[PDB]
Amino acid sequence: KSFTVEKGIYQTSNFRVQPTESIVRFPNITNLCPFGEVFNATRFASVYAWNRKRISNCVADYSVLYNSASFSTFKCYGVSPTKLNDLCFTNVYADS
Amino acid sequence: FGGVSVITPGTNTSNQVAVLYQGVNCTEVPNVFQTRAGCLIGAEHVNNSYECDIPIGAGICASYQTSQSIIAYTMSLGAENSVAYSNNSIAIPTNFTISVTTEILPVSMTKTSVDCTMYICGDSTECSNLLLQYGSFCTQLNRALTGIAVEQDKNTQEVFAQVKQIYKTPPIKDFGGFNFSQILPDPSKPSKRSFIEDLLFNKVTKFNGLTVLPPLLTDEMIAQYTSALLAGTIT
Amino acid sequence: MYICGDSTECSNLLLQYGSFCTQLNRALTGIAVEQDKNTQEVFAQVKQIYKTPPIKDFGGFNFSQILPDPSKPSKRSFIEDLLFNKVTLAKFNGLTVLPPLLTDEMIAQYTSALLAGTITSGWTFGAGAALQIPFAMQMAYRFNGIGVTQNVLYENQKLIANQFNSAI
Amino acid sequence: GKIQDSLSSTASALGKLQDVVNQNAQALNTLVKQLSSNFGAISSVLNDILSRLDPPEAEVQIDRLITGRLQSLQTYVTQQLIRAAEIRASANLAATKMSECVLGQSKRVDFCGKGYHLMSFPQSAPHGVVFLHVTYVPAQEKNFTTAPAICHDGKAHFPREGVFVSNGTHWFVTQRNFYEPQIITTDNTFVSGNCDVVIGIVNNTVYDPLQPELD
Amino acid sequence: KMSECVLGQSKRVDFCGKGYHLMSFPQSAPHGVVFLHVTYVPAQEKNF
C-alpha cells in the first residue's frame, strides 16, 4: 500500500493449483427411487400413525417434483431445494 | 497450496523481482532454481557464499549484487580460521583499541485513550443504551488502556528517574583530553539537548474518539535526566 | 484459505469483515521472524567461525563429547549428535510450517565456534580478536576470579582434570 | 566522531526502536480504519444506520455493529497489552541500562556493548533510550611460549596476578591483557609445594633484589 | 547466559548453574539451547 518499496521479502498472494478436470463417480446403479407410490396412493393413515417408507439403493430426481404438481407449500429446511440434485445423502425417510 | 513472496532489492535501486512460491514444487505450473524453501523463479543460483541480505528460508538468501540480477546464495556464516593452539604457546595483546557501540531500546509508547462508549456506539444515545447491556466490556477496555498509559509513564520514571538530584556539569573543560561536547547539553540550542541527541530526534518521525494523552514527562524534561546522569558520571 | 476454504463465494464474506484476515497473518509472520531472529540473537554471538584445533591436547581435559566429530555426518557432537537421536526417538492443510532461516546444520557450526572459541581463546574472543591461550593457563585465571589462587589449580591439575573428565 | 557520522547517515540505528514506533502506529491505523468495515451490517457509519432504521430493526443492526466493534476494540486492547508488556521489559532493561552501564562498571561479558565495558553514556530518543558503550578490545597479539610454574630450588613459583610469558630467551611475567614484561622476582611470585607435581614447568632464575643490595 | 556465561566468567551467584562458576559450554537441541556449567564447590571442612 505504497508507491515506493524498500528492499525485503513480501508475501502478496496465495497460489492455488487449479484442478484440471471435474470427475464425478456416482454409484453405478440404474434403478430409480420412486416417489409416486408414497405421494400418489390410495390412502394414508391417521396423523397419530405414520409410515416411514424408507428409500435406499436407487437414483432419485427432484426437478420432476416442481411443476408436475403445484404444491401449496414447499419449505426446504437446512437445504436449498434446487441443489438437491448434486449430493448423495444417507437413508432418506418419507412420512405421510 | 502456497504463499507467494516476491524478493525485491528495493524499489529505489531497481525494478527487478524474484518470486519464490512457498513450498510448491519447482516443476509445478509454468531459471526455476529449485530450493528447499520453495521454488524460486527469477534468480540465478551462484556457487559463492556471502553475508545474508534478503533472507528467504532454509539457508538461501537473495542479494541484488553479484549487468545486475537478483542472486540467491547459500549464506555461509563466517570465515573459518583456526587460532593456532599448543600447550606451550600463548598470545598476549601489544596494543588496545577503545570503541563506542550503541544499543537502542524502546522505553514507551503513545498513551492512547479510547472512550468505549464514543467509538463503539457513537454520538447517538439510543445506540449507547444497547451497549450498556454488555456492561463491563466498556469499562474493562478503558481500564486496560489507562493502565497501559500509566505503565508508559511508569516505565519512563523507572528508566530515567534514578537520580534524586540533577547534577550540572562544571564550566571548566578540563576532562583530561576527552571531548564530551557532543554528548553534553548545548546552551545555544533550545531544550538543552546534546548534538548526538538532536540527530536522533530528527531521524525518528480528538481525531475520531481516540485521544493521545500527553506524556507525563516532557521531552525536554527527559533530556535533563539523561544529561544529569551523564554529567554525574564524568564528574 | 483456512476460514473461507477453496470456494470463491466464501471469500467474499471474509472481505466484508475487513483487515482481520490480513492482520492475523501479519501477527503470525512477526512470530515466525522472532523464532528465526531469537535464534540469531542467541547463537550469532561470534563474528567468525573458528575451526576446532586439530591437536587435541587439552592440558589433561578431555573434550571428546562436547566437540564435533569429523567422521560423523552433520558435524554434531557426541552430546550434540546424540541429542538429535534422543529428540527423534521422542502443506498438509491450510497450514504451512515454514523452515527456519538457520538450518540445524548451521546452528551446529555456531555452537562449535563458541566451544572452539572458549577453549582456544578464553574470554578474549567475546570482547575482540580471539587470543590463543593455554587451557591450563585459562583455568588458572578462572580460579583467580572465584578467589581460589591459581597455584591451587596447578598443584593438582591432574586431580582436577580427572574430576572434570569423570563429570562430563 | 564516527558515531555522529553513522547516526546522521542512516536510519538503521533507530530501526530497532523505530520498528516499535512504526509497528504501534500501524496497529492503531488498522483499528481506526476498522471503523469503515461493515461487519455484516447494512452500513458502516453508525449514524447512518440509526437514521434509516426503526428502533427494533435498528436494535439488531446496532447489536451487530457493537459485536463487530467490540471485537475490534478487544483485539486492540489485547494487542496493546502484549506490546506494553514487551516495552515494559525493555524499560526494566531500559531502566537497567539507564542505571547499570551508567552507574558503576559491569563485569558481565557482553551485557553492555561488546568487550570490557569501561563506562557508558545514555542519550534520550523519542520513545526510547539510546546507550553509547565504551569498551576495551585488544587489537594486537604477539605469540609467546608459556609455562605454568618455574622451579628454582625444587620449589615452583606461580605468578601473583599474571601468566608466565617467555620470548624464548628469558622468562618474564606480563599482565594477560597488555604486554608488560617484568623480571620475575619473589615479589611477583609465591612458592607452594615441590616442583615435581606440576605438569608443565620451566627451570628459571630468581632475582632476589635484596641480595645484590646487601652485598 | 550464552553471552554472560560462555564468553566470560559470571560473578553473579547462581546465574550459571549452582555454586561458584568457572565456565560454560553451549549445546544445541531442536528449538533449544542446553548449557553445561562448570562450577567449583568446597568438598571438605576442618574447624579452626
Ligand SMILES: *[C@@H]1O[C@H](CO)[C@@H](O[C@@H]2O[C@H](CO)[C@@H](O)[C@H](O)[C@H]2NC(C)=O)[C@H](O)[C@H]1NC(C)=O
Ligand atoms: C404423481 O401425480 C402427478 C400428477 O398427476 C403425475 O404427473 C403426471 O404423470 C403423467 C404420467 O407420467 C403425465 O402424463 C402427466 O403429464 C403428469 N402431470 C400430470 C398433472 O398428470 C406423476 O406421474 C405422478 N407420480 C409421481 C411423480 O410419481
Ligand SMILES: *[C@@H]1O[C@H](CO)[C@@H](O[C@@H]2O[C@H](CO)[C@@H](O)[C@H](O)[C@H]2NC(C)=O)[C@H](O)[C@H]1NC(C)=O
Ligand atoms: C597502538 O595503536 C594506536 C592506534 O592505532 C597507534 O597509534 C597510531 O600510531 C601510528 C604510527 O605511529 C600513527 O601514525 C597514528 O597517528 C596513531 N594513531 C592512530 C589512531 O593510528 C599506536 O602507534 C600503536 N602502538 C602503541 C601505542 O604501542
Ligand SMILES: *[C@@H]1O[C@H](CO)[C@@H](O)[C@H](O)[C@H]1NC(C)=O
Ligand atoms: C518435484 O517433482 C519432481 C517430479 O519429477 C520430482 O522429481 C521432485 O523430487 C519433486 N520435488 C518436490 C519437492 O516435490
Ligand SMILES: *[C@@H]1O[C@H](CO)[C@@H](O)[C@H](O)[C@H]1NC(C)=O
Ligand atoms: C601465532 O601463530 C602462528 C602459527 O602459524 C604464528 O606463525 C604467528 O606468529 C601467529 N599467528 C597467528 C595466531 O595467526
Ligand SMILES: *[C@@H]1O[C@H](CO)[C@@H](O)[C@H](O)[C@H]1NC(C)=O
Ligand atoms: C570538542 O568538539 C568541539 C565541537 O566539534 C570543538 O569545537 C572543540 O575544539 C573540540 N575539542 C576541544 C578540546 O574543545
Ligand SMILES: *[C@@H]1O[C@H](CO)[C@@H](O)[C@H](O)[C@H]1NC(C)=O
Ligand atoms: C578422550 O576420550 C575418548 C573416548 O574414549 C578417547 O578416544 C580419547 O583418546 C581421549 N582423548 C584425550 C584424553 O585427549
Ligand SMILES: *[C@@H]1O[C@H](CO)[C@@H](O)[C@H](O)[C@H]1NC(C)=O
Ligand atoms: C625478549 O625477546 C624479544 C624479541 O627477541 C627481545 O626484543 C627482548 O629484548 C627479549 N628480552 C630481553 C631481556 O632481551
Ligand SMILES: *[C@@H]1O[C@H](CO)[C@@H](O)[C@H](O)[C@H]1NC(C)=O
Ligand atoms: C606439549 O604437547 C606435546 C604434544 O606433542 C608434547 O609432546 C609435549 O610433551 C607437551 N609439553 C608440555 C610442556 O606439556
Ligand SMILES: *[C@@H]1O[C@H](CO)[C@@H](O)[C@H](O)[C@H]1NC(C)=O
Ligand atoms: C630442569 O631442572 C631439572 C632438575 O631436576 C632437570 O632434571 C632438568 O633436566 C632441567 N631441564 C632443563 C631444560 O634445564
Ligand SMILES: *[C@@H]1O[C@H](CO)[C@@H](O)[C@H](O)[C@H]1NC(C)=O
Ligand atoms: C565443626 O563443629 C562440628 C560440631 O558439631 C563438628 O561436628 C565438625 O567437626 C565441624 N562442623 C562442620 C559443619 O564441618
